[PDB]
Design a protein around this nucleic acid. Structure first.
Lengths: 65, 114, 83, 177
RNA sequence: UCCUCCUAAAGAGUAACGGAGGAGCACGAAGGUUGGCUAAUCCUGGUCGGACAUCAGGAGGUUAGUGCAAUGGCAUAAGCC
RNA sequence: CCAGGGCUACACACGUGCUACAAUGGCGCAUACAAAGAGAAGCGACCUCGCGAGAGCAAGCGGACCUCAUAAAGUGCGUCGUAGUCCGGAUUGGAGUCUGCAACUCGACUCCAUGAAGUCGGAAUCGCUAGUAAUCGUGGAUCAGAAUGCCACGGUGAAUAC
């Protein structure tokens, strides 16, 4: 790669909120803090949670007796 | 300063900055900050990151921005595909709760060109 | 909405009619003037011809219709457009 | 980097064990990743393109190219040779760095990420996905908000068909709703 | 007055108030040279983006392009950087 | 005579009102000062339950006795620091309560979420001469339930008329 036209690419350590650490090479210039990562996301584990897709008859048997 | 859906402001108080999330208003932000124990007066910028995570999981308890938008759109689509009266009112862009349709309803009917 | 301690509302004649259609087991429609009745779960799968003022429009009780009144699926005022 | 090594051990092993591959050079290797930013608004304003250039230079590692128009279209008010987009090709250790940052630290942040499409394979194994907001990447200050200015990322693979490329991508625990 | 095609009868030439079109310029780069590259148009995938902008891959092979009308040519490119 | 519907529709136009566009203000806490009136298949204390609408049990009262019923603007402290914003509160989803045989068409209210237009309004045009205009609350009739209307009542309270 050419010398001066590219921005500096420093290896930093981003820290996930659930406890993961991840050394990446990036150009932000400083260390960085995260919240959600490849671990501890609602899609990546399996807690995807579609809603009840009709709780109507369950609502009728819960409301009325 | 980063709650999984969006960003929150830093110079507002923590109640008002918490109300930037889709799914919480005044009462739910008051209850969230009462659970996590942060005073209502202090700004977001004075908060620290462990306390922001202990805020984050309590906001993650409720239904918030993404699955709330999914829930609302799914309920309105359920009405419109049901064939009920409120379904047809949601269809044609008319007031649903039995409002005046003769004169007013200029919010639901759109701005008045004709 | 009604109160929760009062229970769901249905006419006595409609309840007798739908229980007669359950013990009879047929799927022939029944015409009702009972728009104020809440749909019950035993009515699912039989077409009910609800009165809308002139005629009886036949509505088919699905699973998702089990909370609402019968008259909600029978439009009373017809309107197409001003042009 | 690390995902390159995870490829060279686990993904090479897996794709020998699920397709019958006669050779280790039969495996799909991922060739390049291109980040295109089709701004299009440079028909009147000029500095907005030079801001999207710094955008792709921040999101990616290296400086972008400025893609000019290939043919003139009178429908869009562009002419022959107007700088209408910008693009980055990254390959080697830089695409492995960007791919690990994309799969780990960026793709949760797509603001109701419910799972991206697995039907976006074009026919020869190459996958293409479009992000609408460039704020999902951690390189953006958010005190310097300019515009929404999303991009599209195209992973180009040496797979032959859809299912071999999808095996290669989902081997990396790619989301795939 | 000049240029290209047909009439023009397979060398050249060849008329009509015969059939069709153009020129009265441009460019210090659009010239020289070295090195490199190769189209149009479809299909599929993809943020705004849409028939048609940018991206990627396949199809296809010169149906593209030549500063300008037409003919002849052009990949060793005379086309593109 | 009866059941269901409609009088509540909706490309549009006008009349009269309410709520706003905020800092003479919004919110939170504490505290002060009224008048007039209604109540018996009615008003419904205290206490308990419910975040709240309300529910339960339940004395008093045909009333200068009891209840409706803590007046609100004000005031003191803090906070927002001029943003469509801690303004605005339309619209919509969910969960309810109550009256009523019955709340879909088509009731009122509560709570949570949503957070639209609107930054003082064109030509024009209205009311007002003092406890008045303006602004803040309360009460009553009709009423099973359902006032931003109507009728009344008090709090603060101007400017100007050559």
């Amino acid at each position: 790669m050419k010398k001066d036209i590219h921005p500096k690419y420093e290896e930093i350590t981003a820290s996930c909120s659930c406890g993961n650490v991840m050394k990446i090479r990036s150009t932000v210039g400083h260390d960085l803090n995260l919240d959600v990562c490849s671990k501890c996301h609602p899609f990546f584990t399996g807690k995807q949670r579609d809603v009840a897709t009709g709780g109507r008859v369950d609502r009728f048997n819960k409301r009325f007796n | 300063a980063r709650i999984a859906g969006i960003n929150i402001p830093d110079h507002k108080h923590a109640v008002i900055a918490l109300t930037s999330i889709y799914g919480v208003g005044k009462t739910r932000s008051k209850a969230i900050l009462a659970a996590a124990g942060i005073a209502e007066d202090v700004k977001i910028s004075e908060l620290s990151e462990g306390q922001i995570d202990t805020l984050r999981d309590e906001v993650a308890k409720f239904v918030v921005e993404g699955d709330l938008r999914r829930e609302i759109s799914m309920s309105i689509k359920r009405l419109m595909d049901l064939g009920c009266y409120r379904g047809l009112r949601h269809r044609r862009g008319l007031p649903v709760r039995g409002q005046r349709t003769k004169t007013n309803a200029r919010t639901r009917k759109g701005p008045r060109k004709p | 909405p009604r109160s929760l301690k009062k229970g769901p509302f249905i006419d006595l004649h409609l309840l007798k009619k739908v229980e007669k259609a359950v013990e009879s087991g047929d799927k022939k429609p029944l015409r009702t003037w009972s728009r104020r009745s809440t749909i019950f779960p035993n009515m699912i799968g039989l077409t009910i011809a609800v009165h809308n003022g002139r005629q009886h429009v036949p509505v088919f009780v699905t699973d998702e219709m089990v909370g609402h009144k019968l008259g909600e699926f029978a439009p009373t005022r017809t309107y197409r457009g001003h042009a | 980097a690390k995902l390159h090594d995870y490829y060279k051990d686990e993904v090479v092993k897996k794709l020998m064990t699920e397709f019958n591959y006669n050779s280790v050079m039969q495996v799909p290797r991922v060739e390049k990743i291109t980040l295109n930013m089709g701004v299009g608004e440079a028909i009147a304003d000029k500095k907005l393109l030079d801001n999207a250039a710094a955008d792709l230079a921040a999101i990616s590692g290296q400086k972008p190219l400025i893609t000019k128009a290939r043919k003139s279209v009178a429908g869009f008010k562009i002419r022959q040779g107007y700088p209408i987009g910008c693009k980055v090709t990254l390959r080697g250790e830089r695409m492995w760095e960007f791919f690990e940052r994309l799969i780990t630290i960026a793709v949760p942040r797509i603001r109701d990420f419910r799972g991206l499409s697995a039907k976006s394979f074009d026919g020869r194994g190459n996958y293409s996905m479009g992000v609408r907001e460039q704020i999902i990447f951690p390189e953006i200050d958010y005190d310097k908000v300019d515009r929404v200015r999303g991009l599209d990322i195209t992973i180009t693979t040496t797979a032959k068909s859809d299912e071999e490329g999808r095996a290669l991508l989902a081997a990396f625990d790619f989301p795939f709703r």
